[PDB]
Amino acid sequence: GLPIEKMADFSLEELLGMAIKAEIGAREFYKSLAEKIKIEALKEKINWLAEEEKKHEALLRKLYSQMFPGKEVVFPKEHIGPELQPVARELEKVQDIIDLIRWAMKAEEIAAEFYLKLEEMVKEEEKKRLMRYLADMERGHYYTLRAEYELLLNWEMY
Amino acid sequence: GLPIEKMADFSLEELLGMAIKAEIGAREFYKSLAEKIKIEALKEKINWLAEEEKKHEALLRKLYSQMFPGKEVVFPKEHIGPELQPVARELEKVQDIIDLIRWAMKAEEIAAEFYLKLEEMVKEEEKKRLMRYLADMERGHYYTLRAEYELLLNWEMY
């Protein structure tokens, strides 16, 4: 996707509709990632991350309606940061897991930056907390993923 | 308790004992927190967080056994950072939930920062990897906790 610096070129509605889409993408992503793991430890963490992304959409769908009554969310054809697609193939090597975990955190790291900036391009303290919440959850997924990352890489199990 | 700065006043084993002690009291702290919540959502977050940190104790006890074979764990009277006590009282207001979550992220704050130092205050890559893993996991619990705290502010306020 496009760099975080260019959110200034999009309107607040498109940025919100962008978040919703992104949030739906991560959701199915994490859903499909965990589906293909066979690792009694990682699959759990990933599943719990899918739920969190589930609620993020609910909250974003709500806010959007609040800021835009009677409107139908129109997902922009452009996005910021990497856009993860649901894994269809199978994980042959441990290396594949790495590849997906490295990109996942790469998407979470940018998603946090996205909400921090969105916190600024928004007023009314209640909506600021909301964006703040989303940024914290996203950063949280960063460390969670980073933790399991290093282990898989060194071929070590806890 | 004692500031992270004065970690040098103790040995590696004394510190590891502190770590174990902290993780023990933590686990039982969250167990009581969730127990008392009546909020089918936060009790959920607080419960997943309690489970995640259940393996921390056994993980540390293993390391202490790996660097000090045969020697029983020793717990120093002093301790770094806030010492979370188990919640036995009934939560009457949201402020009470606020306080307890605020202290929890504080404790997670000092904990990750603790495992960051212990990481450097120890040699052998495999061992520093456990510290790093523990620190990132704690760092992640810290952000998750602040998100909650963040969204719990919308509850009351003025």
Side-chain angles (χ1 to χ4, degrees):
Chain A
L2 304 173
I4 210 65
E5 173 64 316
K6 82 186 335 289
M7 289 179 61
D9 301 337
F10 287 79
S11 75
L12 187 61
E13 55 212 302
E14 304 175 284
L15 284 170
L16 296 172
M18 199 174 285
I20 295 163
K21 186 155 206 290
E23 219 48 270
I24 290 173
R27 197 275 182 172
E28 47 176 344
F29 170 67
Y30 283 145
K31 192 241 68 187
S32 60
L33 201 197
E35 237 80 310
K36 321 169 170 291
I37 288 292
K38 290 72 204 71
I39 302 177
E40 48 191 62
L42 176 61
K43 180 196 275 285
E44 292 186 0
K45 288 193 181 177
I46 305 302
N47 259 306
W48 180 254
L49 295 186
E51 148 59 1
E52 291 288 345
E53 306 312 305
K54 209 189 313 301
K55 291 300 297 189
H56 291 358
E57 172 193 30
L59 302 187
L60 288 173
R61 290 268 193 190
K62 172 165 187 162
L63 164 51
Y64 182 99
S65 206
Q66 285 174 150
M67 263 314 100
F68 305 106
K71 278 284 163 292
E72 295 305 308
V73 190
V74 193
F75 303 136
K77 209 62 74 311
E78 289 174 288
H79 56 82
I80 308 304
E83 173 180 285
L84 315 158
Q85 246 53 72
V87 295
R89 48 190 178 66
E90 309 175 306
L91 300 177
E92 301 140 347
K93 333 185 189 307
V94 180
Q95 185 50 56
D96 292 347
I97 317 281
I98 328 301
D99 287 355
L100 276 303
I101 299 302
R102 212 290 182 289
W103 279 100
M105 42 191 273
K106 191 133 61 185
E108 292 292 344
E109 200 179 328
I110 179 56
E113 271 174 52
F114 185 99
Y115 292 122
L116 283 173
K117 185 169 180 184
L118 208 46
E119 190 213 321
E120 315 178 320
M121 293 274 64
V122 69
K123 298 190 172 186
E124 192 169 311
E125 284 286 345
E126 172 173 341
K127 280 50 185 180
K128 291 185 163 296
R129 292 189 195 305
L130 236 289
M131 309 301 318
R132 243 177 279 133
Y133 161 84
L134 301 166
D136 288 333
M137 289 306 309
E138 255 35 63
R139 201 60 176 297
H141 300 342
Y142 177 67
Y143 291 107
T144 299
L145 288 165
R146 199 208 265 170
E148 298 287 303
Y149 173 65
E150 298 190 13
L151 277 51
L152 290 159
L153 197 157
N154 293 290
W155 250 261
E156 304 195 59
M157 198 40 108
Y158 278 167
Chain B
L2 300 179
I4 210 65
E5 196 68 325
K6 70 178 304 299
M7 262 180 74
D9 276 303
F10 309 78
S11 51
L12 186 274
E13 34 246 290
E14 273 183 334
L15 290 181
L16 286 172
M18 283 188 43
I20 300 177
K21 196 165 188 170
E23 234 75 18
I24 290 176
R27 193 205 188 307
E28 66 178 28
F29 163 71
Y30 290 129
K31 259 296 299 181
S32 311
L33 227 208
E35 234 91 303
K36 310 173 178 293
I37 282 294
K38 283 71 237 65
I39 303 187
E40 47 184 59
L42 185 56
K43 177 191 291 260
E44 242 291 4
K45 273 48 178 290
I46 297 300
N47 266 314
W48 176 78
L49 203 169
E51 300 190 59
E52 270 285 10
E53 292 191 54
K54 285 167 190 161
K55 66 175 204 307
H56 288 2
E57 195 188 330
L59 288 195
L60 287 172
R61 314 215 67 144
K62 179 170 175 178
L63 205 188
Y64 189 114
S65 193
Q66 292 172 300
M67 209 59 40
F68 308 105
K71 249 297 142 290
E72 292 298 284
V73 181
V74 48
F75 303 99
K77 293 113 67 181
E78 302 296 315
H79 71 66
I80 297 298
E83 168 170 285
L84 298 172
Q85 253 52 51
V87 200
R89 55 179 152 96
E90 308 183 308
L91 303 163
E92 305 139 349
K93 32 187 165 295
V94 185
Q95 186 48 49
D96 294 339
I97 317 299
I98 302 298
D99 291 351
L100 268 312
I101 297 294
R102 210 177 53 244
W103 273 106
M105 48 173 275
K106 189 71 188 165
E108 302 291 81
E109 180 184 61
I110 285 79
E113 173 167 30
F114 184 99
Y115 292 131
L116 259 176
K117 171 52 194 302
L118 229 57
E119 167 180 51
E120 306 301 7
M121 198 150 263
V122 70
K123 296 194 169 190
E124 193 164 291
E125 291 291 357
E126 178 183 349
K127 280 51 201 180
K128 297 191 300 172
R129 215 155 280 158
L130 266 294
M131 247 55 235
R132 190 69 174 197
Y133 171 88
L134 288 167
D136 282 350
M137 277 310 296
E138 287 295 77
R139 189 70 176 293
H141 297 320
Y142 167 68
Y143 282 117
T144 303
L145 274 172
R146 191 210 271 165
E148 287 313 318
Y149 178 67
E150 207 63 283
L151 239 40
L152 275 177
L153 292 161
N154 297 295
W155 224 269
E156 286 193 307
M157 282 303 96
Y158 328 76

